[PDB]
Amino acid sequence: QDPLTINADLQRVAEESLNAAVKRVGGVWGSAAVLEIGTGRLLALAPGGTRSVSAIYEPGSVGKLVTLAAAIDQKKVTPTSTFTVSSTRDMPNGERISDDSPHETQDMTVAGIIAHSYNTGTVQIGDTVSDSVRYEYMQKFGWGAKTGITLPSEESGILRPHTEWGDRDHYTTMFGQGVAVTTIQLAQMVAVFGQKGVLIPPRIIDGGSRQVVSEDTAQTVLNIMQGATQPGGTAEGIGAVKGYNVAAKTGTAENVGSLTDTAATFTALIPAENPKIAVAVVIYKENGTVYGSTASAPVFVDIAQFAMREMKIPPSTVPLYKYPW
């Protein structure tokens, strides 16, 4: 019978979690997409109108995975390459870049950088690759284009041609600012890292795809992503799905509305040793800041715990991956 892909129980979990989280956090709206890994099948899409597919927003530091992957794919960097992290850092082109909150400067590996999500580290990582190269990766990950799901009013996102980026744009697009995204785009993206560098176009209809990154870089981005829940990681505690290895990335971005809003974002893969779902969450607050971790992780967590039961996936048999930092 059922020609749609939605899992009704999973959908209800999503809507519930989502609704609660938006209330909890004083947001004005939210959205969540759960994609099955390997098939591109939508298991859940909240809030169930079309806003999930048509509301666009600057995603923030979830965009960091695009730049990380580019640098790695181009072999310009490795998990264990080391850079200096600082509360601010003045760049060649006259730009000052700042971390969320000041910290003692120190050297960190790439692994630890995006794990702590330090802009000052990632900006350096992005500088190892040309803007036209980054730009091309951004497009292959599906930014600035409709995913092509069969639901009305999909927005294409905003991805200005790199040849158009100023000194600020050079660096802001490195951590998902100066770019607009829909939640469906974000799920499709992270899905790549569980798909051996392949992007599968999402589907809501079953029935009386492209290579974005190498299989190897996908897997390394996958290992780095597991650093999110470990001590010091932005999703420590809050991102934990008891008994299951979680690869994830938070994001907390400013948006206009001028520049008074924020979008708390979360994109995760689970279970990390062998991903079965790709999850993307966003909660938008209007005159206030809201953190991907405090806001959106809990949603993923509720969804993720159910999905693992629902899909009769056994708990993780192997340790959460660690690179030294």
Ligand SMILES: CCN1CCN(C(=O)N[C@@H](C(=O)N[C@@H](C=O)[C@@H]2N[C@@H](C(=O)O)C(C)(C)S2)c2ccccc2)C(=O)C1=O
């Ligand atoms: C173009 C100017 N302009 C405006 C937008 N803006 C900005 O909002 N910066 C944010 C940012 O994007 N940094 C995060 C990326 O999300 C890093 N990752 C977060 C995470 O994942 O939790 C983090 C660990 C909380 S900080 C930020 C800073 C402080 C608090 C929350 C978010 C800039 O500063 C910036 O350049």
